[PDB]
RNA sequence: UUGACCUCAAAUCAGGUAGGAGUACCCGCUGAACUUAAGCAUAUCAAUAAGCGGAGGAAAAGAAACCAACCGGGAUUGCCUUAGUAACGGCGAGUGAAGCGGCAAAAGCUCAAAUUUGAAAUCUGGUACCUUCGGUGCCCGAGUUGUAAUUUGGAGAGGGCAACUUUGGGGCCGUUCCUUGUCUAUGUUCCUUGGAACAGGACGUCAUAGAGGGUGAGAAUCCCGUGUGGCGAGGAGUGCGGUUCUUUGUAAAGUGCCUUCGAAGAGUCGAGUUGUUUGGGAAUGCAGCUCUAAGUGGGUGGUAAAUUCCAUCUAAAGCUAAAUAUUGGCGAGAGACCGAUAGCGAACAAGUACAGUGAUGGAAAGAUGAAAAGAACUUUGAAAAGAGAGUGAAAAAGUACGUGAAAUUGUUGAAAGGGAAGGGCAUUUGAUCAGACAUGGUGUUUUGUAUU
RNA sequence: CGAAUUUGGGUAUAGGGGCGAAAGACUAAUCGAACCAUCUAGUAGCUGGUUCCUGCCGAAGUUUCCCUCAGGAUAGCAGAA
RNA sequence: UGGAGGUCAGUGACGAAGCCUAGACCGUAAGGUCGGGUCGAACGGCCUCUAGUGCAGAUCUUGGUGGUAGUAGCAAAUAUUCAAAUGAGAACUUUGAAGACUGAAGUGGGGAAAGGUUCCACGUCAACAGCAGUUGGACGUGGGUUAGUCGAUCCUAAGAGAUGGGGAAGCUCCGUUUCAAAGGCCUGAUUUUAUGCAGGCCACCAUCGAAAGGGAAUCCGGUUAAGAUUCCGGAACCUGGA
RNA sequence: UAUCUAGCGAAACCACAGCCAAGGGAACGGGCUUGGCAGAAUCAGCGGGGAAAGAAGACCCUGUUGAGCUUGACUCUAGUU
RNA sequence: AAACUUUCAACAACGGAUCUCUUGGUUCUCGCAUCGAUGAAGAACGCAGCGAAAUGCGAUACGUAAUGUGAAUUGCAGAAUUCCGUGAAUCAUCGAAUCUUUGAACGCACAUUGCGCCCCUUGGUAUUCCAGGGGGCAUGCCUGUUUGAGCGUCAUUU
């Protein structure tokens, strides 16, 4: 059972593990299905940017303190500072976080400036217009890195 | 060379569809474009296939033999033609099977539903 | 997973003058009392049944791939390796054969075959045409009925009908310079693929 | 040859019932003759003829009741849409699309605005 | 005396719903042992098998009584990673997560508890009508022990102060789209072999079609089909330029400043104990029992307990697509898979036959030939059949049918043999057989003189 | 061999259960715990088997420890690089 | 050895693969090549890839086949024989003549359970009837089972088992009258009328469980290839019904 | 009955087989060594031998393999108190 | 010398290996969401000119109707210039129907083709008996409707 100089191993295969084995054969298949779903989804919202404008955010722990990343949604403080309402923003693709707070000015300004950069670079069609199609971009994240 | 994902190049599935064919796959389309006497003279081409056509056997041991289709044996995947028969040993004469693909249609058996395809295609004769 | 185990066979034990292999119970069938479950048994389970979690794809270092690709492109310009692959380049005026990028915009298959005869590469076509033969073995009814040689590899910078014009040309493969598969550049790990470059594809290599 | 349904649909109840009786008489007569002779395929289309007459008779009777209950709820279950038990129990298009007045005033005020990013 | 109300009942009262099936995946309950530990009891197997209840195309989960401790993230799910790690374990055998990070997909919310009280504004059903997935009358009702409007913690409500937006269901052109139809390229030209050309050779054509299949052998061109496009039929679709069908009446919601307030879920939380479970270890979850709260309260902050803070969220109520699962169903496309003792048990009238009272058990069995042309006819025989004959490219294909091995058997014929046979080296005898002075002095005297 | 008799059909009792004038008897040729399927390809230090050729090298049954004594680990002996 | 990539523009219906061959050659060998025969559609060499890759054994698996061996044997139940006919064919089939046996708790005549068409007729003998077969419970094709009275049905028996209700996570378990709001027939009425409306008695509590228990009522004679207490001819009975 | 005949027609078993004596050998050989010898094909019997066949000894031991049964064995447990 | 084991450029057997074939399986991937009290899944019995099985179907029974295509089906037959057409077909569709006995299975019962009750008819010159045709009669619930019950209770005192 135990023999010559080898590392002691822990291979957890004493249950009926062979019944719960998943081979990801559909890696290529899932990727194709995902790109199709992205393709069809973008068509249905044809002018819209296929994503919500996400905010900038500092990563939690002391390990990732140095990094800043894309969060969930804009704080209601940030949205009011821009000049909008959460009900309106959720309709023009600016994701809003009610649980988030701002306890830090640089995140506050960087998110507000992100908002003004969004407004100046997007055009909202009136509900009774002529729909002047405006060369949709599929990524709001790539539009505002 | 095949492109669409709806067409299968599976030999197993193809012969299964061939032998278990309904009229959608019950041979070719069974209606199919004709021989050169009608094709080369006019140019306005096509007309469907029927029983009482006349044909010329262009291949086989009965090659170069003429007659009328006595029956289109769809189940047996062959057409029977009168005057091309096997003489049995007892004097009986049984009709010999023959595949339409080894035939050319020499004289058609016309009807309205043929002349509908002429209008549908745009022919003038 | 259940092949050969869909039975309730049990061993008779010793004392009955038969092998201790499990046997089907019951009676009145012919199957009753017959050996089961064993890789030595007719109708039993095979030894170490094949599994889907066998390793199928094998990872190759990215850099080694591009190393082998560069070796395959480099061996393209070597005449000796291209003849040794059997690529009928005796009538080709020079190798690497590079054509003007008009062939990149050819449209009909007639002028794809016309271009091959003009650059001298059509001898590779007659090779593929006459090297069609039935595959020996059971691969015939696994949708692999025929085998043939490979022809020249036409490499282009832009697709302006080149792929369509050459699609129905047997053995001829087309490829964009961006990809340049090793699977086509060294077919069967044999170096020296006959490549016909368009001018623009050639200059993109730098 | 065999009677045609498109013909029978022009005939009234008494004509069809009379047409049915002498067909059943023809079938009954044919079954007697089935014993004397080995084969008689005529019995098949007579059964088809009997079936054709009954098909149209049931069709007028079912159609007669259909506009008898027309325009009012509670048609007979045999007349109702068969589609499927779960589809039959599913919420209607009107009922599934119902919203509260609270939701209605929010949907009106802020619908999903159509826009696009330019640069 | 006569009417109610509450509770309870009855009717083949008027109209409905549930039950079973399948169950691959999914949500729960219930629940082993073999096994491993080289014994075995905790452990492990396994919170598995078996058992029971309940769904959908997904289910569950889900918009924090969260994670954190940071310069903070911000519903849920899933993948990569964290990680065989923290941790649990006769600390043995073994077991074993989560936060962060990257990504896929991302969507939000709504009830209870509020001060309509100048008007129950609310809803089912019955009848009536209509343009029937419903609208409008009217009526009986239900309902104030509370049905509407309004608010949901991200807020909100009352009151005082402004120059701000929207009045459309299914159509029809059309549009991922669902089910489908139809039209759209080129040799069967000539010689050889053969029964059959679909083989060999010569000469062509088309190719955005040289996939696949069929046809009497290996067929882009005999056909489809394939490839490109074209023209049509019906359908859950407001996404839009319009809608044969008004162009809505003294209303809907959003924002700024200032005052007052601002309900927020109980035999529940929480505590003890027990059992079980977990990596959760002075107790991770759950459950039984006992105890039983509160409002700057409560929960959480992974070592039990006072005291002081701090950081976070807001339970005991509720809905929600996507990414995620799927050995079942339906429909498709494939493979370095198997090839009839293989592959599913079943390629075939296979869960058929057969066995067992029953639960249940459960096979074997694919190939004439291109076509049946399935052997007409004559003679022997009671007949089966034989011998001819005939069909076939082949009866060395006759249905006891492609090929037709071996064992075993009748056994061209040869040989050997006094209680086995077979074997090794060697020769002899018998039988049988491969290999050799065929063109190279004359550069050639005969020999069908460039055939030497 | 007129009875604690023999016996048909109906009915009841079902597996650690039944039934037993008691033999561990009987419970469908199964009984000191039936039969069927599944867990389950249960585990086996034990028995048997383990499929081509040639070339080169070539052992051990000894040490220590082990509920070790028909087994392992360890060292030795051997091959290969 | 099976399959895969590449190549030999390899072999092949003018014959691939397979198989047989005390024919040849090569290799120490694993094996390779070839002559001859058989055969009919595919298959090889070389460079590589890959694996369900090599058998004499496992009381191995499945299948097939020997020696034993024309052997053991085909001897319980007293027993057969003669002739004819039918048939190629008779020890065994039919007919006659004998001889025997069951000897009325039968080798007789009926039934129950079970079987399921074996019944009966006609053709018929490949297989089955451990010899035989012209015969048959065999084979093929058909015919046949006639009820108010014979049974079931009805009744209850040991006992099964719903509801009411109570357990049980639950498949389900108990429970059978229990702590339940468990009930017809006469001129009531007797002309929007059949319950628009004062006409009594209750103290019923499901249902299933016997083809031998209890029960309404049928006999004789005749009839068929096979049915009969059922058909037919006579002669009766019982129950219900104005 | 056996026997012989006509029909019908198995099985067990079987590495190969089947004459001895001694020897030596896994210490009782059909085979090996040395001798004796040894002549086709066979039939009915027969029970000396084939350490005959029938069954992976049921006795005995070993296994860190069981089970039935019993108890002040260890660990629990329905019930009961 | 025969008769009696071995080898066959040998034939014939036995047997079914090998080879080649494959309308099957297996595995992978992709898309979809639809069983049943409007009676499902499943079972039994039947149904064809000539069917036993198998497929399909339900006494309208290998099938009716509606639709498309446009001459079959085919083992043998059999209505046929049914064929220039509201039209063949073991054809495809498939929306309208039929859909026996059952089964969650529903009047009660069920090893019975058992036994009832209500409504409308027809007949036997009959509200009650019998027969025939057609309709019906399960539980648990929910919402509503009528009829009630209870000194539970309110008005309300002949």
UniProtKB/Swiss-Prot annotation, chain A:
The keyword Cytoplasm applies. Keywords: Cytoplasm, Phosphoprotein, Ribonucleoprotein, Ribosomal protein. Coiled coil: none annotated. It is found in: Cytoplasm. Disulfide bonds: none annotated. It comes from the Eukaryota. The modification Phosphothreonine is found at residue 143. GO terms for molecular function: RNA binding; structural constituent of ribosome. One of its GO terms (biological process) is cytoplasmic translation. Present with 133000 molecules/cell in log phase SD medium. Component of the large ribosomal subunit (LSU). Mature yeast ribosomes consist of a small (40S) and a large (60S) subunit. The 40S small subunit contains 1 molecule of ribosomal RNA (18S rRNA) and 33 different proteins (encoded by 57 genes). The large 60S subunit contains 3 rRNA molecules (25S, 5.8S and 5S rRNA) and 46 different proteins (encoded by 81 genes). Belongs to the eukaryotic ribosomal protein eL13 family. Component of the ribosome, a large ribonucleoprotein complex responsible for the synthesis of proteins in the cell. The small ribosomal subunit (SSU) binds messenger RNAs (mRNAs) and translates the encoded message by selecting cognate aminoacyl-transfer RNA (tRNA) molecules. The large subunit (LSU) contains the ribosomal catalytic site termed the peptidyl transferase center (PTC), which catalyzes the formation of peptide bonds, thereby polymerizing the amino acids delivered by tRNAs into a polypeptide chain. This is Large ribosomal subunit protein eL13A.
From Swiss-Prot, chain B:
SUPFAM superfamilies: Translation proteins SH3-like domain. GO terms for cellular component: cytosol; cytosolic large ribosomal subunit. InterPro entries: KOW, Rib_uL2_dom2, Ribosomal_uL24_CS, Ribosomal_uL24_euk/arc, Ribosomal_uL24_KOW, Translation_prot_SH3-like_sf. GO terms for molecular function: RNA binding; structural constituent of ribosome. CDD domains: KOW_RPL26. It is found in: Cytoplasm. PROSITE patterns: RIBOSOMAL_L24. Gene3D superfamilies: 2.30.30.30. Its main location: cytoplasm. There are 2 genes for uL24 in yeast. Component of the large ribosomal subunit (LSU). Mature yeast ribosomes consist of a small (40S) and a large (60S) subunit. The 40S small subunit contains 1 molecule of ribosomal RNA (18S rRNA) and 33 different proteins (encoded by 57 genes). The large 60S subunit contains 3 rRNA molecules (25S, 5.8S and 5S rRNA) and 46 different proteins (encoded by 81 genes). Belongs to the universal ribosomal protein uL24 family. This is Large ribosomal subunit protein uL24A.
Curated annotation (Swiss-Prot), chain C:
Component of the large ribosomal subunit (LSU). Mature yeast ribosomes consist of a small (40S) and a large (60S) subunit. The 40S small subunit contains 1 molecule of ribosomal RNA (18S rRNA) and 33 different proteins (encoded by 57 genes). The large 60S subunit contains 3 rRNA molecules (25S, 5.8S and 5S rRNA) and 46 different proteins (encoded by 81 genes). uL4 is associated with the polypeptide exit tunnel. uL4 interacts with its chaperone ACL4 and the nuclear import receptor KAP104. The eukaryote-specific C-terminal extension harbors a nuclear import signal and delivers the ACL4-uL4/RPL4 complex to the pre-ribosome, triggering uL4 release from ACL4 and incorporation into the 60S ribosomal subunit. GO terms for molecular function: RNA binding; structural constituent of ribosome. Belongs to the universal ribosomal protein uL4 family. The keyword Plastid does not apply. N-terminally acetylated by acetyltransferase NatA. There are 2 genes for uL4 in yeast. Its main location: cytoplasm. Changing residue 42 to E: Leads to a slower growth at higher temperatures but allows RPL4 assembly into the 60S subunit. It comes from Saccharomyces cerevisiae (strain ATCC 204508 / S288c) (Baker's yeast). Keywords: Acetylation, Cytoplasm, Methylation, Nucleus, Ribonucleoprotein, Ribosomal protein, RNA-binding. The keyword Zinc-finger does not apply. It is found in: Cytoplasm; Nucleus. Signal peptide: none annotated. The modification Omega-N-methylarginine is found at residue 42. This is Large ribosomal subunit protein uL4A. GO terms for biological process: cytoplasmic translation.
Curated annotation (Swiss-Prot), chain D:
The keyword Ribonucleoprotein applies. Keywords: Cytoplasm, Phosphoprotein, Ribonucleoprotein, Ribosomal protein. GO terms for cellular component: cytosol; cytosolic large ribosomal subunit; preribosome, large subunit precursor. It is found in: Cytoplasm. There are 2 genes for uL29 in yeast. GO terms for molecular function: mRNA binding; structural constituent of ribosome. Its main location: cytoplasm. It holds the Pfam family Ribosomal_L29. This is Large ribosomal subunit protein uL29A. Component of the ribosome, a large ribonucleoprotein complex responsible for the synthesis of proteins in the cell. The small ribosomal subunit (SSU) binds messenger RNAs (mRNAs) and translates the encoded message by selecting cognate aminoacyl-transfer RNA (tRNA) molecules. The large subunit (LSU) contains the ribosomal catalytic site termed the peptidyl transferase center (PTC), which catalyzes the formation of peptide bonds, thereby polymerizing the amino acids delivered by tRNAs into a polypeptide chain. Belongs to the universal ribosomal protein uL29 family. The modification Phosphoserine is found at residues 12, 49. InterPro entries: Ribosomal_uL29, Ribosomal_uL29_CS, Ribosomal_uL29_euk, Ribosomal_uL29_sf. It comes from Saccharomyces cerevisiae (strain ATCC 204508 / S288c). GO terms for biological process: cytoplasmic translation; maturation of LSU-rRNA from tricistronic rRNA transcript (SSU-rRNA, 5.8S rRNA, LSU-rRNA).
């Amino acid at each position: 059972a135990i023999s010559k100089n080898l590392p002691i191993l822990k291979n957890h295969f004493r249950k009926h593990w062979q019944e719960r084995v998943k081979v990801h054969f559909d890696q290529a298949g899932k990727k194709v299905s995902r790109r199709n779903a992205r393709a069809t989804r973008a068509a249905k919202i044809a002018p819209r940017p296929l994503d919500l404008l996400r905010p900038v955010v500092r990563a939690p722990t002391v390990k990732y303190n140095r990094k800043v990343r894309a969060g969930r949604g804009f704080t209601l403080a940030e949205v009011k500072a821009a000049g909008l309402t959460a009900a309106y923003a959720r309709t023009i693709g600016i994701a809003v976080d009610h649980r988030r707070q701002n306890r830090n000015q640089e995140i506050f300004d960087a998110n507000v400036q992100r908002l003004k950069e969004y407004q100046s670079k997007i055009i909202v069609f009136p509900r009774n217009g002529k729909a002047p199609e405006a060369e949709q971009v599929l990524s709001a994240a790539a539009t505002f890195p | 060379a095949k492109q669409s994902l709806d067409v299968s190049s599976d030999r197993r599935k193809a012969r299964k569809a061939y032998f278990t064919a309904p009229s959608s796959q019950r041979r070719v389309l069974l209606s199919a474009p004709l021989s050169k006497e009608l094709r080369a003279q006019y140019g306005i081409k096509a007309l469907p296939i029927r029983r009482d056509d006349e044909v010329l056997v262009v291949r086989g041991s009965k090659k170069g033999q003429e007659g009328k289709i006595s029956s289109v044996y769809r189940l047996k995947f062959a057409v029977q033609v009168d005057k091309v028969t096997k003489e049995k040993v007892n004097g009986a004469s049984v009709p010999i099977n023959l595949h339409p693909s080894k035939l050319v249609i020499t004289k058609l058996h016309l009807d309205k539903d043929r002349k509908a395809l002429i209008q549908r295609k745009g022919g003038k004769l | 997973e259940k092949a050969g185990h869909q039975t309730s066979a049990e061993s008779w034990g010793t004392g009955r003058a038969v092998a201790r292999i499990p046997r089907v119970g019951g009676g009145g069938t012919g199957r009753s009392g017959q050996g089961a479950f064993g890789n030595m048994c007719r109708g039993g389970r095979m030894f170490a049944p094949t599994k889907t979690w066998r390793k199928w794809n094998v990872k190759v270092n990215h850099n080694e791939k591009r190393y082998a690709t560069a070796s395959a492109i480099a061996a393209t310009a070597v005449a000796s390796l291209v003849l040794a692959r059997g690529h009928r380049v005796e009538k080709i005026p020079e190798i690497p054969l590079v054509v003007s990028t008009d062939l990149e915009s050819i449209q009909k298959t007639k002028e794809a075959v016309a271009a091959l005869k003009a650059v001298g590469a059509h001898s590779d076509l007659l090779k593929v045409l006459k090297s069609k033969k039935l595959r020996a073995g059971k691969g015939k009814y696994r949708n692999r009925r025929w085998t043939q040689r490979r022809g020249p590899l036409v490499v282009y910078a832009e697709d302006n009908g080149i792929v369509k014009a050459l699609r129905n040309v047997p053995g001829v493969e087309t490829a964009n310079v961006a990809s340049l598969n090793l699977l086509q550049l060294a077919p069967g790990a044999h170096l020296g693929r006959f490549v016909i470059w368009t001018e623009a594809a050639f200059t993109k290599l730098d | 040859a065999g009677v045609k349904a498109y013909e029978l649909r022009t005939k009234s109840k008494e004509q069809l019932a009379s047409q049915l009786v002498d067909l059943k008489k023809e079938l009954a007569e044919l079954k007697v003759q089935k014993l004397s002779r080995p084969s008689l395929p005529k019995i098949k289309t007579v059964r088809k003829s009997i079936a054709c007459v009954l098909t149209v008779i049931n069709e007028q009777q079912r159609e007669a009741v259909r506009q008898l209950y027309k325009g009012k709820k509670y048609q007979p279950k045999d007349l109702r849409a068969k589609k499927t038990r779960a589809l039959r129990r599913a919420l209607t298009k009107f009922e599934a699309s119902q919203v509260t007045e609270k939701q209605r005033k929010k949907q009106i005020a802020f619908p999903q605005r159509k826009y696009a990013i330019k640069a």
